[PDB]
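[worker-b] picked up task from shared queue
[worker-b] task type: protein-ligand structure
[worker-b] ligand name resolved to PN7; SMILES cross-checked against name lookup, match
[worker-b] sequence length check passed
[worker-b] input payload:
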Amino acid sequence: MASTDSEKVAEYLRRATLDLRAARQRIRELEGEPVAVVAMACRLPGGVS
Amino acid sequence: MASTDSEKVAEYLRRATLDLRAARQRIRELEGEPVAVVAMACRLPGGVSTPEEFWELLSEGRDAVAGLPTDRGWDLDSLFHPDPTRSGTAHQRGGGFLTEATAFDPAFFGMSPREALAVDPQQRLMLELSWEVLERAGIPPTSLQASPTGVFVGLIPQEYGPRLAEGGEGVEGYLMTGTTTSVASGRIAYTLGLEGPAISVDTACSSSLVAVHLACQSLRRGESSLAMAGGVTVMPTPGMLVDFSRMNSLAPDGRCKAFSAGANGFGMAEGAGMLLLERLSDARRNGHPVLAVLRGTAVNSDGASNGLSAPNGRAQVRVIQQALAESGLGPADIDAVEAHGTGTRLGDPIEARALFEAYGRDREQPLHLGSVKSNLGHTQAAAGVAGVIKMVLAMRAGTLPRTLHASERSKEIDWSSGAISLLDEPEPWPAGARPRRAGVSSFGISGTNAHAIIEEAPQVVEGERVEAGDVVAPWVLSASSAEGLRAQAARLAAHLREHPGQDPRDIAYSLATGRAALPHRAAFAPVDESAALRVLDGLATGNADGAAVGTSRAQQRAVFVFPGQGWQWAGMAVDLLDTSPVFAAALRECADALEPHLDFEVIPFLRAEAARREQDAALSTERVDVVQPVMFAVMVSLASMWRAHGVEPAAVIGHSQGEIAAACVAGALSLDDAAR
Amino acid sequence: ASPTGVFVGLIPQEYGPRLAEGGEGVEGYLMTGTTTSVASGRIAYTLGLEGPAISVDTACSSSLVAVHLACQSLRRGESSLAMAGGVTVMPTPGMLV
Amino acid sequence: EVQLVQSGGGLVQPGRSLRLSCTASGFTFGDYAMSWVRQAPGKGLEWVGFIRSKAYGGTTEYAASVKGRFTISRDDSKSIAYLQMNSLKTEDTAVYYCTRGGTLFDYWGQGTLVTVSSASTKGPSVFPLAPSSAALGCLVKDYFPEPVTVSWNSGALTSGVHTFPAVLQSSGLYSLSSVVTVPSTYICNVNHKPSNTKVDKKVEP
Amino acid sequence: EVQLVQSGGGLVQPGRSLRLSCTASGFTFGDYAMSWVRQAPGKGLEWVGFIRSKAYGGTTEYAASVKGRFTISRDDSKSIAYLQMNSLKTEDTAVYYCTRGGTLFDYWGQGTLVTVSSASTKGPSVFPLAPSSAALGCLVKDYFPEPVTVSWNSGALTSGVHTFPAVLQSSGLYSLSSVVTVPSTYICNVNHKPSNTKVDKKVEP
Amino acid sequence: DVVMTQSPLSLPVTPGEPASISCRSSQSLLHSNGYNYLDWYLQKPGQSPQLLIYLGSNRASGVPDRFSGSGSGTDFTLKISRVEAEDVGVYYCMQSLQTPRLTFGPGTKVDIKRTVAAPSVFIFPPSDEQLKSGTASVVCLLNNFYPRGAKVQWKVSGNSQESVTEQDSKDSTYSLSSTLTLSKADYEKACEVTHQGLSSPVTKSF
Amino acid sequence: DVVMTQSPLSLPVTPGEPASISCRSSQSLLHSNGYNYLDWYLQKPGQSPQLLIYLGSNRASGVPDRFSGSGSGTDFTLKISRVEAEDVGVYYCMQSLQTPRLTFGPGTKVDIKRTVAAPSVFIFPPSDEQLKSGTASVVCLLNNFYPRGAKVQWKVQSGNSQESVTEQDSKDSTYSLSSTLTLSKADYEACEVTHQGLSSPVTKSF
Ligand SMILES: *P(=O)(O)OCC(C)(C)[C@H](O)C(=O)NCCC(=O)NCCS
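[worker-b] inference finished, payload out:
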């Protein structure tokens, strides 16, 4: 057998945790994923172009 | 741990799953949470001023393109010339035009009769609509102060008065702050006190569905608990049908003949529209009406089209498929589509070929295609929120309304798949077993397609149901003017002669907790609905008999004044405890606080009349040893009664022994203290 | 044909001739010029962008509110790229008046 | 939501029988193994016991401090957990909690204040604290049970007021010493609610 | 990010040895007991075996079909799982796959088309399929091993073309029967890549 | 004993339409913990098997919202709320209560759903040069049929082999090449099918 | 034996500043599954204990993202990314390897952090009516001090002193001590502190 429930209910805990570690980094990317400022163009007062 | 080999890890799994179940329900409450349409306000062409006067135009198939405005100073003689290309001429000789443009209530909204002449007509029919979209969602419009609630208005900046460099006489600094699209969503958030994202978006003819989409995506996240999303295009100058006519894009009769062989171009009209939106599990937890749920929305520019106004045929398929994969649905769930249906001869063939590619893909049931622009004309930026008012009254009336000008379906489209059934007749649309979903699409001149999927409100089986007929509550009327308060009891009176037998408790719930506490108040409390009909007609003429009229300035702050002696009658509150347990019990605490300090209790005293108090060892009034504590007990129980009915004093003042009751209710002396 | 939003924040102002009177050469394009609407769609047309091209009107906050809308079109993912930004070039002294 | 709302606290003399009920609404009661964690006033939490799930046998594990005295049960069809507290002694004066996990305590409920004291309901012995020459205070020694509330200038002075958390003597009584700090002539009114004995105190050096 | 890339397939004879390597990059290799499963061509998955985590210790559970023949190992410092296949037989012609789990096969390898056949590399025996009076087809009988590529009109006709999946005889050879359906005079071309033997077929009734 | 788990082995799905594979276990897969020990795997056609659901109802990250799981250890039901071209293949109901597990089960053969098609039987007598090569292969081709529950018998049986291709895209049918690898003499001595595209036996011979 | 777990028992936090409570276990809490068996609980002052972290690093749902979890088999750590006014209380490091656990540990006494204060030692001789009453209570109230680590003696010895301390206030964020020397009739016929708000013993008597 599979070491009853010692290597099973603990094999399902490294999924229900590793899925919680990937379903919580989806919530930190749906709300606070830091967006970059890849480039900046400006035509501002003065000689600024 | 002990039994078998699992008593501890199977607790961390239970938790890692109820944390995974509660973290993947947070992902579906942040990107796919249904956004309920809590209410709809709309002033559309054809005299439409409410979404029950708007269904009474769709259901009877009435077109509302009936002619150009006369009361707007338009030069209706320089707008027309036999030459198709003059410089100031317009080709629409008709169109859907409202008379509510040259009409506004400045005094109500706190603007001077000079600040309001300068208010763009797109701002003055967004303030009026913001008051109505809240006064018909239950939410008192004055109750949303400092409350996160975004105003998302879609507006094609339109030109109202004198140029900003040609300032008028009274309208001078207020000509830029009353006309800038900035202050249409901003004037609302100021007058209504809202503190949320008050953004005035502008995406041409999709600025209503973009504003609806930008509000739904501001709700799913949470930046505004509530949101007013909509758009208005009221065209002050004939400057848009004289340019759109210069690209020969208009129809010579003002009709948007959608998906019809007589298609000439846009039938440009003008109108408004606002949706009160809230997350579905925020409009069910607060009891707000849910009319339909906006499942998903999508905004998608046409990209490199064959012209700026030219439509893309494969950028609509990617917005009918982004809003169809953001709502979690498929092309076979949407029963009907409120398409743009501009009535153009190269925009309708391109729209519908994008509708046989995103919806009509092996459709078991034909897609019921329609457009509200057929009934009222292209309402520009109000189209898209006038399609989520057409397909939210189609939810709640069990009928798909007509597409008014499309019997001779156009020959440039392929209606051979049998997958789209243009609505040339009223198609019944009852609540079946599969949820009733529709799609409203507004694509614009700037090339910003928008598509929103609507679903019917979750069937509320019970909710606020029936109880028992009992004591009637005041019918709470209030208005900001003595002539507007006569109109309130000239419109509630009609809303009951048209709908008789309306439970009085329901006309005293949505009138008291459904309206604002405006200065001129005329509450009253009749015997029944028909008894109140009498006072309603009396107040139409201003004659108050049985009605409690008054004037206020948002005053509040009542003062409990406590008479000492001389106010007792032979039967003080004989039935006031026999009708409600909020006075009997209010007497109970006083009685048990008077029992250790008085023998005869107050309970049989006020229970019995003087004619029957002569045989209970308690004289009617002469027994100062008994009636003084009775007075105090009646006084304190009554004060607790008003407090239980939401009447709280800004000050308590007592006369001689009403001082005792005032001290008891002020908190400085306990109930037992002042009772003793 | 890429998902790339354009979020421009402007103010209506007043540029050409009042559309009711039209113009001589600028007749059908006067509308397409004086509209904050196409001031985000024109950009998404020339480059071919297929992302949400929305225009913002909050006056002195239009730009920062447009970066807000763009930031969340990237947090949710509606557009993989965005061009946020605001312009107030004043072609008339109307505003200083 | 899960809410483990409790009930069953009160006042008893050492050697009584007291019942602690844990109303579980929100989760499947039979899957979890409810446990009862004791927190004596102002010290760390100590775990009393826990019943295993009905599917895990239902074996109840108790502490060394309360074996042979307390017994824990559970019912699914009536969905309540029980701490049956028999033969109480002075140690059981504490805020007993009901957590939903034997090794993984979860909701924890609210906090049922159980008190095992041999005292009776008596009002305060309000003894003032004369200043040295400074702060002005007043004792409330020998009252029972807690509630207690002490104000200064009858709820007029609130700045500088420190109502020291109460204190248990070996006699089973309580002692609060409420003191204000302000240079000067002040009044302290203590209201022992269970007995309603409001005593007032005027203090001078 | 996790990945379980495999290596070690090939062509051997019944009674030989073969190595199957499972490169695990993305997760801590020592935590998961890793399995080795097998898909016989076109039937359901059968689990070969699995080695338990080094932290757990345990043992190496194999099937009844391969006990005493296959042995499975694992290394953390070199981070590879091994299916050592020995004393092979015709049954081992299949796509062995290595999954990260012993009860929950969460991640999988692409599958190694480990083949155990007694045949040798020979080109096709291209035999045509004359129409009855209709469709036109051509056999590829007796080729080995798979790859195989049959097109029509030399990759001109692609509509109606149904390449019939590899069929293995008892002799260890393969047989494809590619046929087009169109009323008419057509060309089928076959190129056994291991031996590079391109044979061409013209067919008439 | 062992848990015997069965399913609707030949379940058809049509795109855009919710579907429902079910699993039925002989023993009880609801273990003491209150957690079912049934897993749902997907082997999309010619790819590595995927983990869709663990513990009966939980879904494995990276698996779309479409794959839901509802039911009890004994009678389970994987509910796909939206079948696209990706929700096809073989769905294995695979227990976890007892592990040794020699097999993943027969697996639910999922197919893109259309109506029933008529199998086009082509009897192709072997090329005679093949009879001059030492073998004989009369091939009874069955083109354009769905569902695939049709067998070919050889009368006037047992040497027949089997070659089915998985479902195509624009026609979504199946095609079978039943092969009678055969020997020199016994050629000097017919195929038909019982697919539900027809009812009567259609026997055409070489 | 038993796992002995200790922590920085008196850790101060200042709002808006990342903080770090640590746990040190005598035995190894990393069980064979590769999962640590340490849990982090929070008892907010006068409320029901909360579950912040289970299995060493996993955060319970409904718990602010600030609380982060980490640790090997012996040394462990809780990293509050942002301490606000609700992040204060007692943080219990509570193992799971050896159940039963009679105690939750001493717990980390968290406090809103300021600089050091000045213990206002105020010797208040008992009112004489109290001596008329049968007892004696000289009270040495210390007021406005932080941190709360003050010895408070009674000489001229100690052993009849009982303790009264309030939790941290808001606008001053200090502590106050009521060391009462309940007492008897005759023996009435001095207090000082060693709080680090000062260094020298400050002895004032009745
Ligand atoms: P040209 O043949 O492209 O005509 C110019 C016009 C302005 C008519 C333009 O191309 C057009 O066809 N506009 C209608 C298409 C459309 O998308 N209407 C909905 C946006 S309001």
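[worker-b] attaching auto-annotations
[worker-b] The longest strand of chain G covers residues 136-145.
[worker-b] releasing lock
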